[model samples]
Target: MKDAKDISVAVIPKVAVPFFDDCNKGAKTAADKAGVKYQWVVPQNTQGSTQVQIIEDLISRHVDGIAISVNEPKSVESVMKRAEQSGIKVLTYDSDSPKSGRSMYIGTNNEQAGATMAETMGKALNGQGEVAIITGQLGAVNLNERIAGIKKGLAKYPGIKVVETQGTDDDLARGVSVVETTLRAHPNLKGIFGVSQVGGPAVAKVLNTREFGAMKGKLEVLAFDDLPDTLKGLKDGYIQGIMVQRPVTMGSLAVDHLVAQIQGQEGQPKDIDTGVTVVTKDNMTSYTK
Candidate 1:
C-alpha cells in the first residue's frame, strides 16, 4: 500500500469550461485537505472518443483512482472496465455512465431536475404555448435524460407543445446560431428549456439584442447550470429560471470518496445525488452568495 501522500487520482471532465472550473475549485480544496495528489485533466473537445483516449492514458499511467463526467456511456464502457481490472478506483461526477464498471456516481439527478425545469417553464408560460429545447450534445446520457423528463413533465400541460429540439455540440457559437434560427422558425414560441449549460446563455445573448424586442420578456427561458452568463440573464430578466447544480460539492465529494476508497474503505454508495437548486429572480441574490 502507498502512503497518503503517494496516492494519486485524476478528474476527467467532458471538456474545459467555466462549470468544470468551479468543480476544479472544490476538487482542489478537498485534495489539499486529504493530502493526496490530484489532477484535473480536461479533454480538448467534447467527444466520447477523446475521453476514451484520455482514460486509456490514465490507465497506462496506473493512477490510483479516476473520477470522470462521462461524455458517452457506450464508448467508455470498455475502457472503464479495463481500468477497474487494473485495480483503479473509478467513479463519476457531474455526468455518469451507469452501465460501466464505475463504483459510484456523484452528481445531480438530471431527469428529476429536467422535470423541475419543465414545471417551472410550464408555470411561467401559463401551461399554454409552443416551446423548444436546446441541448449541448444529443448523445450525452444526462442531457437525454433531462429531455425525457422535460417531455414527460410537460405532458401534464397539454397546451404546452415542444416545437423542436436542437443540439449545438457544446459550441457556444453554434448554440447562438441554433437559438437565433429557432426563434426565427418559431415566432410564436412561448418558452425555451436549455438542457445544457450553453443553451441558457445563448438564448440570453439573442434575446438581449434589440432585434428580439418584445419577445424578450414574453418568451420564458429555463436553463441548467449557474454560470455567470446564466445568472446575469436571470438578474436582467432575460432568463426566468435556472437549475443550478452543486458542482463544488460534487467535486469535493468525488475527491473525498476516492481518497477513502484508495485507503481501502468499502461500502461506498453506488449513487450519490449531489442535488440541484432552482434559482429565479426572486431568490437570485441569496443563491448567488
Candidate 2:
C-alpha cells in the first residue's frame, strides 16, 4: 500500500459507449475524492485482444489498480494474473472476467436483470406473444447470463415464445439489420428485447420508422441499459420499459473498492451487487436526469 496521492488507477471497459462513459465518470469521481490519479483506457471497439493490450499498457505505466469490464472472461486471464503478480489490484465492473484473477466483481446481477426484463415484457404482452432479442457479442458473459435469465423468466409464460436472440457484434447497423430481418421473419412478433447497449437504440430506430408502421403499442420494446436513444424511446412511448443497471454506482463503487485495497483497508467484499431497476415512463425522470 502507498499514499493515496501517489496511487494511480485505470478503469477500462469493453467499448467507449454511453454506459461506460457514465461508468468512467463515476470512477473518476471516486478517484478524485480519494486523492488518487485515475484514467479511463477504453478500446475503440469491444474486443478482447484490444482490452488485453490496454491492460498491458496500464501495467507498464505502473498503475496501482485496474478496474476493467472484460469482454471475454477467459481471454484476459494471463494478463490479469500478471497485474496481480506485479502487485497491482485488479477489479472488474459492468462485466467480470471470472478466470482473469481479479480480486472481485462489481456490477449488476445479470441473470436477475434479464429475468426482470422478461417479466416486464411478459406483462406488456399480457403473457402471450412472440419476442426476439438483439444483442452484442454472443460470447460475452453478462449478455449470456441475461439471456439465460430471460429464458427462465419466459418459462413462466407458456404462451410466450422467444423467437430468437441474435448477436450484432455491438454494431448499430448490424443490430438494426438483424432486427429488421427478424421483424420480417416473425410478422406476429409482439416484443423486441435489446440485450445490449446497441440493441435498444437500434431497435428504437427501426420502430420509429414508417417502414414498419412504427407500431408504438403493437410491438412492445423492452431493453437493457438506459442509453440516450433508449431513454428517448421510453419518453416517446416506443420502448415500453428498460432494465436499468446503475452504471454510476458500479463505476463509483469499483474505484472505492480499488482505493480501499490500495490503502490496505480491511474487509472488502468479494462480491458486490449494484442491482438493477426497471424504468418506464412512470419513473423515467429519475433515470433521465
Candidate 3:
C-alpha cells in the first residue's frame, strides 16, 4: 500500500461548469486534509470518448484512485475495467456507470430528484400544461434516470403533456438556442424541466429577454443544480424551482471513500446517495446563504 502523501487521486467531471466547481472545492479540501495529491481534470466537452481518453491517460500516470462524473457509461466501461486492472481504485460521482465495475458511486439519487422536479413543476402548473425537458448530454446515465423519474412522476398528472426533449451537449450557447427554438416551436408551452445543470439557466436567459416577455412569469421552469444564474432566476421569478444536488458532499465523499478503499479498508458501500434538495422562492433565502 502506498503512503498517504505518496498517493494521488484524480477527479474528472464530464465538462467544465460552475456546478462542478463546488465538487472541485470539496475534493481539494479532502485531499488536503488527507495529505494526498489531487488532480481535477475537466473535459473540454461532454463526450464519453473524451472521458475515455482522459482516464486512459490517468491510468498511464498510475494514479492511485480515480473519481469521475461519467459522461457515457458504456464508453467508459472498458477503461474503468482497465484502470482497476492497473491497480487504481475507480469510483463515480455526480454521474454513474453501474456496469463499469467502479468501486462505488457518490451522488444524488437522480431518478428520485427528477421525480421531485416533476412534482414541483406539476404543482406549479396546477397539473395541467405542455412541458419540455432540457438535458445536457443525451447519454449521461444520471440525466437519463432523472428523465425517467420525471416521466414517472408526471404520469400522475394526466393534463401535463411532455412536448419535446432536447439535448444541449452541455454548451451554454446551444442550451440557450435549444430553449429558444423549443419555445418558438411550442409557443403555448406551460412548463419546462431541465434535467441537467444547463437547462434551468438556459430557460431563464430566454425568459429574461424581451422576445419572451409574455413567458417570463407564465411559464413554469424547474431545473437541476444551484448555479448562480439559476438561483438568480429563481429570485427574479423566472424559474419556479430547482433541484439542488450536494455536489460538494459528492466530491468529498468520493475522495474519502477512494482513499479508504486504496488503503485496503473494508465495508465500503457500493453506492452513496449524496442527496438533493428542492429549492424554490419560499425556501430560497436559506439556500442562497
Candidate 4:
C-alpha cells in the first residue's frame, strides 16, 4: 500500500464533462490546499446505468477515495456498499444515495433547495397561478427532492397549482424544444421550475430567443445551478431567478470527509449540508460564474 500521505482522488460525476469541469475547478483548488489528487469521471451522457458501470469499475480499481453524484441510487447501492467494504471511502455530491453507506453527502440540501426556489418564485409570482415544471431526470435524488419541495411549497399557497412537470433527459436541445412546446401548449403557465442545470437554462434560452415572454410579459422561469449562461439570462431579463448549487464546496469538503474516513479519523461528518441559495435579480450579479 502507498503511504497515507500520498493523496489520490476520483470524481464519479453524473452529468456532462463541462459541468464537472466547472465543479473540479473548485475541487482542484481545494486539493491543492489539501495536497491530494483528483480526477473527473463522467459518462458521455446522462446514463445512470453507465454511471453504475463506472462506479463498479472504481470499486474494482480500489482507488484511494471517490466522490460521486449518484445518478441512480437504487441501481448502484450494491457497488457503493462494496466500495465501502473494500476500504474505499465514498462520498456523494450533487445528488445522493441516502440508502447507500457513503461516508458523507457533500452537496446541496436538495429538498430545501427545491423549497427555496418555490418560496422565492411563488412570492415573485404573487402566489396564485398555474405553474409548470421541467425536470432533467426524475430518477435522480436531487431532482426528486426539488420536485417534492415545489409540490409542498405550492400546496402551502392555495392559489398556485402545478399543472405539469416534464422530464428532460439532460439533452439541452430537447430541453429547449420541450419548454417551447410546453409554453405553446400551456398559455396560462405563469411560472416554471427547471429542476436541473440543463433544463433551467435551456428553458430560459429558448424563451429568450423565441421572445415568448415579451408577448405576454409573463413566464416566471426559475432555473437551478449558477451557470454563467443562467446568470447572463438574469442580467438580460430572460430568467427571473436560479438556485445555485456549490460545486466548489462540494468537491473539497467531500475529499476532506472521505479522506478522514480513509485515514481512520474517528470524527467525521454524517451529512454535510453544502447548502444552496436562490439567486435572483435582486442579487444575481454577485453569483455570476
Candidate 5:
C-alpha cells in the first residue's frame, strides 16, 4: 500500500454526549495502541442531516480514511462516495450502511444478543407470557436486528408473545414514559425488553414505577447496556437480564480498524461484531463500573 505521504486519520462520532457510552474512547484506544494520529469529530446534532454535513466536511478535508457511526447512510451517500472517489477508505461502527460502500464495520452481534435477551426473559417468566419491545429508535440497524432476533427467540416458546415494539429514540425521559404507558396499555404484558443503553435504564426506571408488569422479583425485564441506572436496577431486582458489551473494547477496536485503513491497509473489511452476553444479578457486578 503506497501513499504520497504517511496517512492521517479522523474518527467522527455522532456527538460529544456524556451519558452515552463513548465510541471515541474505543477509537482513541486503538489509535494510541497503534501509534496513529486521528482526530475525533462529531456533529452539532446527532441527527442524520447534521451527520451528513460532518461527512461532507470530512470528505472536503481529504483525510486518508474515516470511521463513523452513520446517522443515515442515504443522507450522506454522495459525500461518502466522493471520498471513495478520492481513494479514501470508510468504515462504520455501532451503526451501519452496507450500501454506503464502507470498507468495514465494527459493533455488536445485535441479532444474537437480542435472541439471548428473549430466551433469558422467556425463561425468567417460565416460558409463558407476553413481552413488550422498546427500542431506541425506529429503523436503527442495531435495534431493528435485536428486535427481530427477540421475535425469533419468542417463536421457539409458543407461550410467549411479543406484543409491542416501540421506538424511544434515546430520550430517557420520554423513553421512561413510553415504557410505563406500554405496561398500562398492555396489561397482559409480562416483560419489557429495551434495545439500547438508554432503553435498558429507561425501561428499568419505568418498571420500578409501575405497580404491575415486569418489575420486582416477579415478572421478567430484560434489556441492553451497562449504564449505571440499568446496573443498579438489576441489583435491585427491577431488570432481569442485561446484554453487556465491552464499549471500551468496541471504541478501541473501531479506532484500530480505521487507523489501519488510513495506513493504507484497506481491503474489503467486514463490520466487526464486538460481542455480547447476558448479565444476571449474580454476575452483573463484573460489568458495571
Candidate 6:
C-alpha cells in the first residue's frame, strides 16, 4: 500500500546488543539500494514484554513494514497482526514467530545448526561424556528449533547424554551465573552449548574466570553466534567451537524481502535459511578479523 520511495521499514531486535550491530549495517545497505527509509528499533532490556512495547511504538509511528527478531513470539503475535491489519507489512529475522502471520523468516537453518553444534561438541568429546546447554531465552522459536536439532544429532552418540539445559534470559550476568552454577553441578561436564550469542560470551567469560582452559581438554564448548567475546574466547581456548550465523545476511534478506513486499511482490519464501558455520581455532582469524 506504500510506495517504494515513500515507505519506511523498521527492524527490531530483542535487545540493544552488539550482536545486532552488523545486522543493522547490512539492513541500511538494503534500504539505500531500495531507496526507502529504515530504522533499527531495539529494547533497552531483553524481555518479551519489552519487545511487545517496542512493536507498539513502531506501529504508532505508522511504519510501512516490520522485521523483528522475536524474543517471545506469542507476546507479539497480536501486535504483529495489528500492524498487518493497518496495511503495514511484517516479517521476522533471526528468531521467528511463524504463526504470527509474518510473511517469512530470515536466518539460520536452526535445526541444522543445532544438529551441527551437537555434532561438533560430540566430535570434541569423542562420542562420550555428559553435556549441558545455556539457552538464552525460553520462547524463541529459532532457538527451540536449534535445540531440537541438537537432540536429534545427539541421538547418534549414545555415550553423550545431555544432563541439563538452563535458561539465561539473554542477560550476560545471568548467563555467566547459569554456566557457573551448571558447571559446578556437573563438574565432569565434557561439553556445553550456548544456544544464543549472549550465552556463548557468558560461557567464555565464566570459563576464563575459573581458568577452565587450564584444565586442558577438560571441557569441550560449542555455541551459537560469533560475537566479539565469543571469537576472543575461541582464540583464547576458552571455547572450542562456535556456530556463526550470518546476521548480515539475515538483515539484508529481511530488508530486501520487506522491500519487495512493499512494492507489491508477495511470493517470498515462507522460510529463508541463510546458513551458519562452525568456527574453531583453526579458522578463528577468518571470523574474528
Global lDDT of each candidate: 0.88, 0.86, 0.88, 0.76, 0.74, 0.83
- In candidate 2 the C-alpha lDDT for residue 247 amounts to 89
As a TM-score, model 1 comes out at 0.97
For model 5, the stretches where C-alpha displacement exceeds 4 angstroms are 1-6, 17-20, 210-215, 266-268, 287-289
Q: What is the C-alpha RMSD of each candidate to the true structure, in Å?
A: 1.3, 1.5, 1.6, 2.2, 2.8, 2.2
Please give the distance, in angstroms, between residue 243's alpha carbon in candidate 4 and its true position after superposition. 1.0
Model 4 score (lDDT): 0.76
lDDT of 4 at 112: 85
In candidate 3, the residue pairs with backbone N, CA or C atoms under 3 Å apart (3 or more residues apart, or in different chains) clash, namely none
lDDT of 1 at 37: 91
- The residue-by-residue lDDT of candidate 1 on 180-210, one tens digit each, is 9999999899999999999888999998788
Task: Score candidate 5 by lDDT.
Answer: 0.74
- Which stretches of model 6 miss by more than 4 angstroms? 1-3, 210-213, 287-289
Clash pairs, model 1 backbone: none
In candidate 3 the C-alpha lDDT for residue 189 amounts to 92
Give Cα distance to truth, residue 98, candidate 1, Å. Answer: 1.2
RMSD of 3: 1.6
Question: Compared with the true structure, what per-residue lDDT tens digits does model 3 show for residues 1-289?
Answer: 7899999999998788788999999999999999999999999877678899999999999899999998888888998999999999999998899889998888888889888888888888889999999998788889999999999999999999999989987788999999999999998899899888888788888888989878887788888888889889998888888888888888899899889988888475678787787788898767520
Count of clashing pairs, candidate 5: 7
* Model 1 error, position 28 (Å): 0.9
Better candidate number, 4 or 6, judged by lDDT: 6
Q: Please give, for residues 7-108, the per-residue lDDT of candidate 4 as tens digits.
A: 677887786644566667767776677676667787766656787778778777767788888777887788778887888888788888877787778777
Q: What is the lDDT, from 0 to 100, of the residue 66 in candidate 2?
A: 92
- State residue 41's C-alpha deviation in candidate 3, in Å: 1.4
How do these models rank on TM-score, best leading?
Answer: 1, 2, 3, 6, 4, 5
